[PDB]
């Protein structure tokens, strides 16, 4: 039933009764602890289990309780007099046991350990039964064996009714959601488990209706062009993005931000721009880019808010910034001055990405009754018709347990810790490689207060945002569209530059060292990275990580860097890509191919297409509407032309290029020379170089000769006119 | 206390305080600097602290460090704003001087340093007491004022226990040792005090048990036929060694590294060849001959290794192979793939050869825990208690704390870079001597990549491996037994050719210039060299070199050589060998000595008899194992034969002649006619020319007649069977 063990020191043992559980000693992380009982001159073990501030009951056996410290006794939760020692104070121990338990489990996850406590014989879906469909033939042996009796067993439906109901949110299902929503300051939580994906095609489908005016970040996830444009019908409002010679996912151009440019470039609709006081339904903007871009929240809802019906803020990226003192400003949620005139705020979460949750698990915080009186307003019928359209009717139970033991995981001063003493590991994991001269510098400011960065207090760095700011115009970061006060550094992603770039003169130095070479030599080493663009490379950072993961990491990275500066051999340093291509990178050393792959993106001035890509001067031009694009997508209108000739042909698909790992011409949009520039570079390169070849979506490869050239579904009007169907 | 000045610019001047220690100007080798305070703008002050590598704490003081370059900021440590000028500024640059001289001083001298410092009255060992005897008598108080206080003050023992323990290592002198192992890549480090003769002691007496087989290198040094063989009692499988017409001591041939002929060789004991998979316990090799010689450790372990439980690189005339990123195929501590098949490596080197340490010091790297849980390997507690039969109870402090400074100054890119800018010294001096047509020529390739040696940029040239490598079959050093990529020329030894021998035909030229004349021109001249064989003179190469010190050598070259093509007189010369033998040279000039001294070593086919000594078809027969003619020496039956009848007798000490400086016949082994010749012709030499004789060890010489004739102890078996002692 409980699996909490009780830690007590040594004078302490023999003075309670409770050897019902496994007593341990005190030396340990107190995460497995139900109640810690000590001494009250055994001052330094309970002062450890105080600063955890997971909230254990600590237990003070005194000779003279008059005489116990005040300091003291704030951390003491109940005292053990010696001046009776009985059966009642084995009571006591196994009440604050039974009490803590109750408090540390959340709503969903208490009751399905209670279900699957229980012997049931299961008749219903799904049809495995506990998994006793697996354990009948070796293959599904393999797999029940692989993971264990109890993901089966949990894994029930609505026939099992205690549990309450997923979809139209009754029983413990809705007791974990409204929980989340008191942790996450919002009105209503959704808990989706089709990922932040279908969670997009919730918000924007209950809110889009065909030919609203949609506020859209040019930085914004797919999913958000598809939903909010081919799929709901909604036109967008494009707001140019910044870019850096590292081909940094940066936020909105700070001009961009100003109501009168807004409302010219909202000329899709003349009479929905020039008196509507609101001419837009919804406004995407993405929070927290990949790159570690976080926006301040704040100053978006002031500047843009009054123009919007809703603002979304795709927070996938993000979301532990609520949780994080400094990050306050970043933190759409904990917006006090909401009124009548103010917008609603949907924030939509990948748990998954960097909170605790399984991969496909993200919820929605709704926070719009500050508006609800107004015929704009969203209620929760209409919001949950669109919730039922993408959630399915047999949800996984365990998935929606992970969203809500994430919401206690984050709650009170215990979670709040955690993303704390991270900020202490990773300012210190920087310090190591600045200090140590490494070519893989990490992206933060290099001189703050007039101290060099890594010069300043860790304790003080975790707790001022002046460490962590983009300021405006500095050379470093080198965004040229940034205002003060408005963008700032997260620090939960561990951002390594790789040399080969020179932020401060804006162009290529002579000799570089490409990320995707970091990135195959860490992962022939076990160390399994984010991504890596060009010329930089990503590690994610939860509480997940330890000191000990960092300097694993900050070893490799040296070994790499000597490897580099002696000259060693291809077949030494990466031998996965050698025993592949061999006769191609035959008696290649790494400065050898180092030198030549970094020549072919300087020679092809790659960053200052990646720049373009996301300015309005060399946005696509319109052609059709992304909803006018997919229907004729649909209905077959279309002919797959390789890029050589597709200049000025109107894509039917967005084309995704990584990096950046956004869309560069929308479905409708009509392939600019900007776009086909890019992509013939990234093109090249896969033929060029086989084994360091970027991730591509949106068009397909055919080979051709000894050369595999490149695609794109694009509109035929010939098979539009020639088409009875839909009218010849 | 602290020795360290604070190197400042003149603007710089008036901006700190610590005038407690001598401040200074930039113009130094900032070898006496503590911390260096510059200018922001001041950048090729700041580049030049940088550029020594040291690691020397850089602080610059600015009007604007928002402004200051990326580049340059990676080079500074901390800066001083300007945007208060305090006492807390004085507290940051002595605590940065004192941060860094806790960096450079090693574990044992910063101890010894510092109890130094104290007034101890001294009671204990050595009896001098802080060398207060010897400046109570006149002989005495001469050597005290000779080497000054310190040296008799710094000579502790272990009744100080503050320093440790130097025999079963503890305190700060394990520290050392666990700090060399760490700079040497090495499981373990022994610090041997009585060179590494009695560290060749350790290593076999710690492996070898009596009868126990050990592959031979036939180039192996005197202690190691000593220790392996006749101490212990190991049997050798002696491996045949190339010799070119200079009688340059080169690697092992190529077609021994077989195994079919090894265990075809090691005929010793049928058994312990036959089906024992590792018929040899230990291996020596010379890893570096005195010739420059340097093999492929890599390749040696490779090809010998699953035949051996252990091998040992005698690398006393070497190791900095390690710190030369070039060399790193030499380096045996280097080798990464290291398994339980592999053998254990044993690396032993003398620190005072071509390192940084007093004459005696040396050590043992030990790399053997990956065959740590077999029967073969040999733990801390074996390795030990050998260690403890030939370190001395009462060793000698300063020399521990050279070998502890000399791992400190190998150490990082401080010391990698002494080794670099060396090569480039002599890499240009080889250019000066080669393109001003010096009869004195240095060896090394003539042709390299198509191109004139010469004719290479000196920076391709010291991390270019093709310019310092013995090519298959090539002429120029006419070796007849190398492999491909199998040895490298030592770029540390100074070796230059002197005129006689032709490489080309393998023959003698008409006219030659015996080394022997160039080493006392020389030493007449203040320079000293390390050797001179026939046709060869050498020079050692450390960071004790400076282009001046290597001009001043090519000057005496040039020299020398202009008074041999003009044919001047021997009492011009040569003045030294002259005021003392007169009535021999009377009226001689140099071409006239030259020409005797140079062909009667051409008559006598001097490089034929040299070559013959290292070939199998030529090795002495074996009439009795190496320990078993130790015992008949200890047993005094022995007759001392002369040189005309000793061929066939069994010598009973082992004959070392220079050159090349190696054991001919070994104790045990019969006196070959090759031995016999090549001893009668270094005979004839030594009467036939007095002032140029060759040194001669394990023979004895008596003034018979107007000739001095030479002797051997050999074996008298009339004395043994006339011997009731051992059994008549
Ligand atoms: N998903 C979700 N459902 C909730 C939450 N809180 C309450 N609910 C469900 O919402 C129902 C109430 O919704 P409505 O009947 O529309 O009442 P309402 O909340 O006033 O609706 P609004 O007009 O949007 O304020 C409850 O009966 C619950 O089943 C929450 O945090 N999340
Ligand atoms: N000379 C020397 N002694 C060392 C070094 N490192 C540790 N020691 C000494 O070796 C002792 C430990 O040796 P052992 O007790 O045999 O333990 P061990 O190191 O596991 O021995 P192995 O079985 O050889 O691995 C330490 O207590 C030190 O005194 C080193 O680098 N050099």
Chains 1, 2 share one sequence.
């Not at 810690?36 to 909230?55: C, H, L, S």
């Not at 309780?65 to 003491?76: F, G, N």
């Amino acid at each position: 039933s409980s699996s909490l063990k009780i830690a007590s020191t040594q004078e302490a043992r023999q003075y309670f009764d409770t050897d019902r559980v496994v007593v341990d000693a005190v030396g340990s992380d107190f995460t497995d602890v139900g109640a810690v009982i000590a001494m009250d001159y055994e001052t330094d073990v309970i002062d450890a289990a105080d600063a955890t501030k997971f909230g254990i009951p600590v237990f003070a056996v005194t000779k003279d309780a008059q005489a116990i410290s005040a300091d003291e006794l704030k951390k003491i939760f109940h005292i053990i007099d010696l001046e009776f020692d009985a059966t009642v104070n084995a009571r006591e121990i196994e009440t604050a046991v039974n009490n803590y338990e109750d408090s540390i489990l959340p709503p969903f996850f208490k009751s399905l350990k209670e279900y699957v406590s229980r012997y049931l014989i299961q008749f219903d879906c799904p049809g495995h039964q506990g998994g006793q469909y697996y354990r009948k033939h070796p293959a599904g042996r393999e797999f029940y064996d692989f993971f264990g009796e109890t993901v089966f067993r949990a894994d029930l439906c609505n026939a099992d009714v205690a549990l309450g109901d997923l979809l139209i949110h009754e029983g413990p299902a809705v007791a974990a959601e409204k929980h989340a929503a008191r942790v996450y300051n919002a009105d209503k939580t959704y808990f989706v488990l089709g990922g932040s994906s279908n969670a997009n095609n919730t918000v924007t489908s209950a809110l889009v209706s065909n030919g609203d005016l949609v506020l859209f970040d040019r930085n914004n996830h797919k999913s958000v062009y598809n939903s909010a444009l081919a799929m709901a019908g909604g036109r967008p409002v494009y707001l140019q993005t910044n870019r850096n010679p590292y081909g940094f996912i940066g936020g909105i151009y700070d001009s961009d931000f100003d109501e009168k440019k807004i409302r010219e470039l909202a000329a899709k609709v003349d009479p929905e721009r020039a008196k509507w006081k609101r001419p837009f339904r919804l406004a995407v903007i993405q929070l927290g880019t990949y790159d570690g871009t976080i926006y301040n929240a704040h100053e978006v809802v002031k500047r843009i808010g009054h123009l919007c019906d809703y603002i979304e803020f795709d927070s996938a990226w993000v979301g532990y910034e609520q949780f994080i003192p400094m990050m306050r400003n970043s933190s759409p949620l904990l917006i006090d001055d909401l009124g009548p005139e103010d917008p609603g705020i949907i924030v939509v979460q990948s748990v998954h990405k960097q909170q605790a949750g399984f991969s496909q698990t993200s919820q929605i915080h709704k926070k719009d009754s500050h508006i609800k009186g107004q015929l704009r307003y969203c209620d929760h019928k209409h919001f949950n018709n669109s919730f039922n359209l993408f959630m399915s009717t047999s949800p996984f139970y365990p998935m929606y347990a992970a969203l809500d033991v994430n919401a206690a995981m984050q709650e009170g001063e215990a979670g709040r810790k955690l993303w704390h003493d991270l900020l202490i590991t990773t300012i210190e994991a920087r310090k190591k490689l600045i200090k140590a001269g490494s070519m893989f510098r990490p992206f933060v400011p290099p001189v703050v207060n007039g101290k060099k960065w890594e010069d300043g207090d860790t304790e003080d760095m975790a707790n001022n945002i002046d460490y962590w700011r983009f300021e405006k115009g500095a050379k470093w970061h080198a965004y040229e569209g940034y205002g003060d006060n408005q963008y700032y550094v997260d620090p939960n992603k561990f951002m390594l530059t790789t040399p080969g770039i020179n932020p401060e003169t804006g162009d290529y130095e002579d000799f570089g060292v490409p990320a995707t070479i970091v990135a195959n030599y860490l992962r022939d080493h076990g160390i399994i990275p984010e991504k890596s663009d060009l010329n930089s490379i990503l590690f994610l950072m939860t509480p997940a990580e330890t000191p000990a993961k960092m300097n694993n990491l900050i070893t490799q990275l040296l070994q790499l860097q000597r490897l580099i500066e002696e000259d060693a051999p291809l077949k030494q340093v990466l031998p996965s890509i050698y025993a592949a291509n061999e006769e191609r990178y035959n008696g290649y050393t790494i400065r050898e191919l180092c030198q030549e792959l970094h020549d072919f993106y300087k020679n092809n001035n790659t960053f200052t297409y990646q720049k373009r890509l996301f300015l309005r001067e060399f946005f696509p031009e319109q052609g059709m509407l992304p909803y006018e694009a997919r229907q004729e997508f649909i209905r077959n209108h279309n002919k797959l032309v390789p890029l050589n000739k597709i200049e000025g042909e109107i894509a039917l698909e967005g084309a995704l290029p990584y990096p950046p790992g956004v869309f560069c011409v929308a479905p409708g949009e009509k392939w600019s020379e900007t776009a086909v520039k890019y992509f013939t570079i990234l093109q090249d390169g896969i033929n060029n170089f086989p084994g360091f070849a970027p991730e591509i979506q949106g068009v397909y490869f055919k080979q051709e000769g000894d050369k595999v050239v490149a695609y794109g579904e694009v509109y035929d009007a010939e098979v539009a006119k020639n088409d009875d169907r839909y009218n010849n």
